[PDB]
């Protein structure tokens, strides 16, 4: 039951289900203590049973329990743990992650097969904890907190911050992702190249594997952090290392529309 | 009484409690029929149950009847003035002791909490809970700078004397967690109350000199 950005309160539907169960349970205790007739007790026991059922699994038996003033069924424990929006599929089998970005993709023909065009502003935010350390290493900032405050304002960023940024990303790779990830090559590791602009530059040869054209696609960028994660991306997930299709064994990064036409 | 926060069966069971109370207090000597007297108790029970169980954040009867009276007065003014009344008009019609501030406070009190699972948009994949950040647990940045401040403070206190650093860490509660007093700190070292505030001040002054010479601790003050 959290107060929100303003002053009003926001609470979950489980509190309402718990309250009804407690209200009916307490009322049954009072009714039993008063020597109520069997019809009143039987109705209260039945309502207590239904309150437990609604809390455990709302809508499984009888009409779903709805918040007064609305027709939306209350979310029970079973609803929380089951379904596409349940705990498993939404928070356990898949999660939202930090150090992740997204932008429109454009074609980069001058890129190598293992390279991608990462915008400077995206790389600054994606590699922020690494960048803050590097600025601390050089004379850009005295400590991490001063470095972070410097990066808070766009006009307060000097030209040496960018120079530190390329030192940060040297050798490191990022994961480019386009949804839906139908096969495993829907996520590939690329060596980022800092470019001016806001769009990601994608190599033409990896378009077929990603099923990505340039009529307005968007891609997700992910930054592996440790040496284990970097080694896996650089060795196993690198785009230049996945040239054949795991489904058929035939080449998947091969000449395409404009390349075939020219040759 | 349906549609006032309690289901139909909840209203009946609460009224049954009032009916039981009516039987206990009913007197047939007055020659009045039972329904005449039982109707009072049943309606009293249903209304009290509504005042006590129809809100997630419980509001007392006296404030609930005030909220209900406030809503009734607002409706009467709204239908007479042909528009939504302002707080001044509602306060004036309510009576003495009521101003626009009190009306606004009561309306703010009468705000029901909103469900965390209410969807937004036709797509059934977004709820209020997905847009409310958790501001209780410290962020990774906040936890880091706290660790950065702690390591820089323990390094700055090393330049102090062995006892002088102990006094500041004890007077500022860096050891036991809680701030101690000069008398309490005095019992630890067997020192009187007055002497410690001087060595605490002297140790504080030396840290000020060190910080002014290095400036490795100013940034953490924000």
């Amino acid at each position: 039951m959290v107060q929100v950005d303003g002053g009003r309160f926001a609470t979950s539907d489980l509190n309402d289900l718990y309250r009804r169960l407690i209200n009916r349970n307490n009322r049954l205790k009072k009714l039993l203590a008063q020597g109520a007739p069997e019809i009143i007790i039987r109705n209260e026991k039945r309502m207590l049973q239904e309150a437990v059922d609604a809390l455990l699994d709302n809508g499984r038996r009888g009409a779903p329990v709805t918040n007064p003033g609305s027709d939306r069924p209350l979310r029970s424990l079973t609803d929380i743990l089951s379904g596409k929006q349940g705990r498993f599929r939404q928070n356990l089998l898949g999660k939202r992650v930090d150090y992740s970005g997204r932008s429109v993709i454009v074609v980069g023909p001058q890129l190598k097969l293992h390279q991608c065009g990462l915008p400077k502003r995206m790389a600054l935010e994606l590699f922020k904890p690494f960048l803050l350390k590097k600025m601390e290493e050089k004379g850009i900032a005295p400590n991490v907190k001063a470095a972070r405050r410097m990066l808070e304002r766009q006009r307060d960023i000097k030209d040496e911050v960018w120079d530190a940024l390329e030192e940060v990303i040297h050798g490191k790779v990022v994961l480019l992702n386009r949804a839906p990830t139908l096969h495993r090559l829907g996520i590939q590791a690329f060596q980022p190249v800092l470019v001016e602009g806001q769009s990601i530059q994608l190599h033409p040869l990896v378009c077929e594997a990603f099923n990505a054209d340039f009529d307005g696609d968007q891609m997700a960028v992910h930054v592996p952090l440790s040496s284990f994660a970097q080694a896996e991306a650089r060795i196993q997930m690198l785009s230049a290392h996945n040239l054949l299709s795991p489904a058929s064994g035939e080449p998947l990064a091969k000449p395409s529309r404009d390349i075939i036409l020219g040759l | 009484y349906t549609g006032r926060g309690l289901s139909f069966l909840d209203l009946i069971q609460e009224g049954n409690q009032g009916l039981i109370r009516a039987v206990e207090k009913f007197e047939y000597k007055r020659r009045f029929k039972f329904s005449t007297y039982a109707t009072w108790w049943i309606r009293q029970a249903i209304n009290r149950a509504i005042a006590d169980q129809a809100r997630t954040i419980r509001i007392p009867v006296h404030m609930v009847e005030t909220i209900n009276k406030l809503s009734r007065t607002a409706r009467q003014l709204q239908q007479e003035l042909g528009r939504e009344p302002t707080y001044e008009e509602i306060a004036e019609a309510m009576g003495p002791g009521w101003d626009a501030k009190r009306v606004e406070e009561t309306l703010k009190i009468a705000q029901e909490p909103v469900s965390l699972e209410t969807p937004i948009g036709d797509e059934k994949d977004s709820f209020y809970g997905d847009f409310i950040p958790d501001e209780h647990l410290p962020s990774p940045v906040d936890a880091a700078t706290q660790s950065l401040l702690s390591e820089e403070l323990e390094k700055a206190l090393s330049k102090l004397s062995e006892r002088e650093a102990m006094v500041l860490k004890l007077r500022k509660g860096l050891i036991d967690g809680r701030e101690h007093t000069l008398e309490e700190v005095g019992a630890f070292f067997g020192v009187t109350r007055e002497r410690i505030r001087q060595i605490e001040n002297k140790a504080l002054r030396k840290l000020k000199y060190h910080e002014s010479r290095t400036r490795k601790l100013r940034d953490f003050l924000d």
């Binding site: 019809i39 109705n43 039945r46 309502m47 239904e50 009888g62 | 139909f8 069966l9 009946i12």
Partner: peptide, 16 residues
């Protein structure tokens, strides 16, 4: 009367 409708079931019970 109706097993799935608690209100109708209660009304039947009090009707006896």
């Amino acid at each position: 009367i109706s097993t799935s409708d608690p209100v109708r079931q209660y009304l039947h019970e009090i009707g006896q």
